[PDB]
mmCIF file of C-alpha atoms in Angstrom:
data_model
loop_
_atom_site.group_PDB
_atom_site.id
_atom_site.type_symbol
_atom_site.label_atom_id
_atom_site.label_comp_id
_atom_site.label_asym_id
_atom_site.label_seq_id
_atom_site.Cartn_x
_atom_site.Cartn_y
_atom_site.Cartn_z
ATOM 1 C CA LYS A 5 -16.897 -7.014 8.989
ATOM 2 C CA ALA A 6 -16.158 -3.215 8.381
ATOM 3 C CA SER A 7 -14.481 -2.175 5.210
ATOM 4 C CA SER A 8 -10.805 -0.667 5.684
ATOM 5 C CA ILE A 9 -7.470 0.021 4.346
ATOM 6 C CA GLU A 10 -4.991 0.185 7.067
ATOM 7 C CA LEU A 11 -1.258 1.120 7.592
ATOM 8 C CA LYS A 12 -0.156 -0.765 10.843
ATOM 9 C CA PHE A 13 3.153 -1.016 12.278
ATOM 10 C CA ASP A 14 4.417 -3.900 14.453
ATOM 11 C CA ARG A 15 6.233 -1.506 16.468
ATOM 12 C CA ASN A 16 6.633 2.507 16.204
ATOM 13 C CA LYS A 17 9.632 3.201 17.999
ATOM 14 C CA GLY A 18 13.256 1.939 17.747
ATOM 15 C CA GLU A 19 16.420 3.021 17.852
ATOM 16 C CA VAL A 20 18.473 4.878 14.944
ATOM 17 C CA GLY A 21 19.623 2.340 12.233
ATOM 18 C CA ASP A 22 16.565 -0.333 13.076
ATOM 19 C CA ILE A 23 13.725 -1.038 10.741
ATOM 20 C CA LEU A 24 10.121 -0.561 11.431
ATOM 21 C CA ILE A 25 8.102 -2.661 9.420
ATOM 22 C CA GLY A 26 4.776 -1.179 7.891
ATOM 23 C CA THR A 27 2.016 -3.484 6.952
ATOM 24 C CA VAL A 28 -0.611 -1.968 4.250
ATOM 25 C CA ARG A 29 -3.794 -4.534 4.543
ATOM 26 C CA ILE A 30 -7.424 -4.215 3.209
ATOM 27 C CA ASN A 31 -10.326 -5.855 4.954
ATOM 28 C CA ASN A 32 -13.713 -6.675 3.537
ATOM 29 C CA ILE A 33 -13.478 -4.527 0.506
ATOM 30 C CA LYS A 34 -16.178 -5.947 -1.673
ATOM 31 C CA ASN A 35 -15.060 -7.510 -5.102
ATOM 32 C CA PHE A 36 -11.577 -5.865 -4.533
ATOM 33 C CA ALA A 37 -9.378 -6.107 -7.762
ATOM 34 C CA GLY A 38 -6.894 -3.454 -7.394
ATOM 35 C CA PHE A 39 -5.597 -0.148 -5.610
ATOM 36 C CA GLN A 40 -3.529 2.859 -5.998
ATOM 37 C CA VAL A 41 -2.055 4.437 -2.785
ATOM 38 C CA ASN A 42 0.171 7.288 -1.866
ATOM 39 C CA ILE A 43 2.044 7.139 1.630
ATOM 40 C CA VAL A 44 4.111 10.122 2.906
ATOM 41 C CA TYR A 45 6.951 10.105 5.389
ATOM 42 C CA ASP A 46 9.829 12.581 6.362
ATOM 43 C CA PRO A 47 12.996 11.415 4.432
ATOM 44 C CA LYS A 48 15.308 12.688 6.951
ATOM 45 C CA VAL A 49 13.768 10.783 9.659
ATOM 46 C CA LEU A 50 12.805 7.461 7.825
ATOM 47 C CA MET A 51 13.969 5.734 4.947
ATOM 48 C CA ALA A 52 11.835 3.225 2.856
ATOM 49 C CA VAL A 53 13.634 0.059 2.692
ATOM 50 C CA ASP A 54 12.823 -3.649 1.682
ATOM 51 C CA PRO A 55 12.083 -5.163 5.120
ATOM 52 C CA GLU A 56 14.454 -8.484 4.532
ATOM 53 C CA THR A 57 17.291 -7.119 2.877
ATOM 54 C CA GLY A 58 17.353 -3.308 4.101
ATOM 55 C CA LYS A 59 17.769 -2.191 0.297
ATOM 56 C CA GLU A 60 16.489 1.598 -0.326
ATOM 57 C CA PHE A 61 13.344 2.005 -2.295
ATOM 58 C CA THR A 62 13.977 3.618 -5.704
ATOM 59 C CA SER A 63 11.206 5.226 -7.722
ATOM 60 C CA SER A 64 10.261 1.983 -9.639
ATOM 61 C CA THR A 65 10.422 -0.221 -6.240
ATOM 62 C CA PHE A 66 6.898 -2.049 -5.812
ATOM 63 C CA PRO A 67 6.772 -3.326 -2.157
ATOM 64 C CA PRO A 68 6.947 -6.786 -1.341
ATOM 65 C CA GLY A 69 4.696 -9.083 0.895
ATOM 66 C CA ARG A 70 1.158 -8.960 -0.513
ATOM 67 C CA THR A 71 -1.005 -11.720 0.150
ATOM 68 C CA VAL A 72 -3.675 -10.782 -2.457
ATOM 69 C CA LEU A 73 -3.877 -10.004 -6.086
ATOM 70 C CA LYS A 74 -1.067 -12.811 -6.977
ATOM 71 C CA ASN A 75 -3.195 -14.983 -9.223
ATOM 72 C CA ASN A 76 -1.412 -14.912 -12.749
ATOM 73 C CA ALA A 77 -4.547 -16.263 -14.399
ATOM 74 C CA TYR A 78 -6.267 -12.845 -13.895
ATOM 75 C CA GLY A 79 -3.054 -10.509 -15.105
ATOM 76 C CA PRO A 80 -1.948 -8.535 -12.153
ATOM 77 C CA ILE A 81 0.089 -5.449 -13.160
ATOM 78 C CA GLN A 82 2.410 -3.422 -10.718
ATOM 79 C CA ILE A 83 3.171 0.127 -11.033
ATOM 80 C CA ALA A 84 5.303 1.965 -8.897
ATOM 81 C CA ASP A 85 6.155 5.765 -9.119
ATOM 82 C CA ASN A 86 7.934 6.785 -5.540
ATOM 83 C CA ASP A 87 9.703 9.717 -4.672
ATOM 84 C CA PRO A 88 11.858 8.639 -1.813
ATOM 85 C CA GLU A 89 14.021 11.681 -1.860
ATOM 86 C CA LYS A 90 10.793 13.514 -1.169
ATOM 87 C CA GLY A 91 9.517 10.834 1.062
ATOM 88 C CA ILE A 92 6.769 9.814 -1.204
ATOM 89 C CA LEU A 93 5.544 6.208 -1.805
ATOM 90 C CA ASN A 94 3.043 5.763 -4.743
ATOM 91 C CA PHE A 95 2.275 2.544 -6.136
ATOM 92 C CA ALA A 96 -0.552 0.647 -7.779
ATOM 93 C CA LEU A 97 -1.706 -2.826 -8.763
ATOM 94 C CA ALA A 98 -4.589 -4.414 -10.509
ATOM 95 C CA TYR A 99 -5.836 -7.505 -12.159
ATOM 96 C CA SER A 100 -6.121 -6.669 -15.865
ATOM 97 C CA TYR A 101 -8.429 -9.700 -16.587
ATOM 98 C CA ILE A 102 -11.178 -8.406 -14.285
ATOM 99 C CA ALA A 103 -13.562 -10.517 -16.798
ATOM 100 C CA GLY A 104 -11.955 -13.704 -15.980
ATOM 101 C CA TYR A 105 -11.590 -12.686 -12.315
ATOM 102 C CA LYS A 106 -15.204 -11.906 -11.956
ATOM 103 C CA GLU A 107 -16.531 -14.988 -13.891
ATOM 104 C CA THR A 108 -15.009 -17.111 -11.498
ATOM 105 C CA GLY A 109 -16.967 -15.228 -8.615
ATOM 106 C CA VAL A 110 -14.454 -15.541 -5.822
ATOM 107 C CA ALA A 111 -13.402 -12.101 -4.784
ATOM 108 C CA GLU A 112 -10.025 -11.459 -2.854
ATOM 109 C CA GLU A 113 -11.654 -8.908 -0.100
ATOM 110 C CA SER A 114 -8.843 -9.050 2.717
ATOM 111 C CA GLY A 115 -5.283 -9.589 3.024
ATOM 112 C CA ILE A 116 -1.786 -7.726 2.837
ATOM 113 C CA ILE A 117 -1.263 -5.529 -0.115
ATOM 114 C CA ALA A 118 2.421 -4.529 0.751
ATOM 115 C CA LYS A 119 4.958 -4.408 3.428
ATOM 116 C CA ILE A 120 7.425 -1.842 3.696
ATOM 117 C CA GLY A 121 10.504 -1.223 5.812
ATOM 118 C CA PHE A 122 11.089 2.179 7.573
ATOM 119 C CA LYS A 123 14.710 2.532 8.507
ATOM 120 C CA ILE A 124 15.258 4.947 11.367
ATOM 121 C CA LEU A 125 17.674 8.005 10.730
ATOM 122 C CA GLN A 126 17.167 10.184 13.413
ATOM 123 C CA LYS A 127 16.114 10.165 16.875
ATOM 124 C CA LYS A 128 12.908 12.363 16.188
ATOM 125 C CA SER A 129 9.243 11.941 16.644
ATOM 126 C CA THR A 130 7.738 11.487 12.947
ATOM 127 C CA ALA A 131 4.327 10.271 11.260
ATOM 128 C CA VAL A 132 3.624 7.846 8.290
ATOM 129 C CA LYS A 133 0.287 8.238 6.764
ATOM 130 C CA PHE A 134 -1.797 7.935 3.669
ATOM 131 C CA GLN A 135 -2.161 11.573 2.122
ATOM 132 C CA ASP A 136 -4.015 13.038 -0.681
ATOM 133 C CA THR A 137 -1.928 14.036 -3.806
ATOM 134 C CA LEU A 138 -3.086 16.175 -6.827
ATOM 135 C CA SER A 139 -2.198 13.062 -9.070
ATOM 136 C CA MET A 140 -4.842 11.379 -7.579
ATOM 137 C CA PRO A 141 -8.014 13.048 -7.805
ATOM 138 C CA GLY A 142 -11.053 11.476 -6.468
ATOM 139 C CA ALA A 143 -9.209 9.420 -3.717
ATOM 140 C CA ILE A 144 -10.026 8.916 -0.120
ATOM 141 C CA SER A 145 -7.122 10.069 2.049
ATOM 142 C CA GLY A 146 -4.726 9.118 -0.683
ATOM 143 C CA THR A 147 -6.264 5.493 -1.278
ATOM 144 C CA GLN A 148 -8.084 4.318 -4.412
ATOM 145 C CA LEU A 149 -9.586 0.687 -4.454
ATOM 146 C CA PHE A 150 -11.048 -0.655 -7.433
ATOM 147 C CA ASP A 151 -13.763 -3.598 -7.929
ATOM 148 C CA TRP A 152 -13.885 -6.350 -10.610
ATOM 149 C CA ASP A 153 -16.228 -4.182 -12.654
ATOM 150 C CA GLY A 154 -13.459 -1.797 -12.904
ATOM 151 C CA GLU A 155 -15.144 0.907 -10.727
ATOM 152 C CA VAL A 156 -13.799 2.845 -7.795
ATOM 153 C CA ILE A 157 -14.859 1.751 -4.489
ATOM 154 C CA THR A 158 -16.474 3.839 -1.840
ATOM 155 C CA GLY A 159 -17.312 3.896 2.064
ATOM 156 C CA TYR A 160 -14.427 2.171 3.692
ATOM 157 C CA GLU A 161 -12.440 3.763 6.316
ATOM 158 C CA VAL A 162 -8.866 4.830 5.737
ATOM 159 C CA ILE A 163 -6.848 3.658 9.114
ATOM 160 C CA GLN A 164 -3.762 5.664 9.744
ATOM 161 C CA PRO A 165 -0.810 4.128 12.112
ATOM 162 C CA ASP A 166 -0.967 5.243 15.450
#
C-alpha cells in the first residue's frame, strides 16, 4: 500500500553485448494522471535501447512498455527529451483530458510506465538512477508525478535499482 515509483531490473549483471531490462513502475499513486522522470547512466558502459529490437534510443525516443496512461479517451501526450550521448533519459506522459478522466472516477494508480533496455558496452560496475536536474525544479529525486486535478503529487518513495 506504500506509494512509490521504482526503477527495477530483472537482473543487474550480464556479459558485454547483452541487454539488461529496466522497468519503471508506479505503485499506489493516488489519482495518478501523468509523470516526468530524469534517469542517468554512464553512456560509456550502458546504452539505452529498445528492449525487443536493441535499436539505440535517440532524443525523441519515448520508451515502450507502459500498462497505464494508454486510454485514448483521455488524451495521453508523450514527450521525450533524452540526451543518450550524455547518459540522460528524460521523458514525460500525461492525460490532457484530466476533466474527462476525473469525471469517470476510476484512477490508474499502479502499473508500468516504461521499459528500457540497457545494452552492456563494457565489463565495469555501473549505476542507473533517477536523479534531480535543474530543468526539473520541485522534483523528488528526478521524478514528478501529477494527479487528475493537474497538481504535483508528493509523499511517495523513489526506489532506485540495487
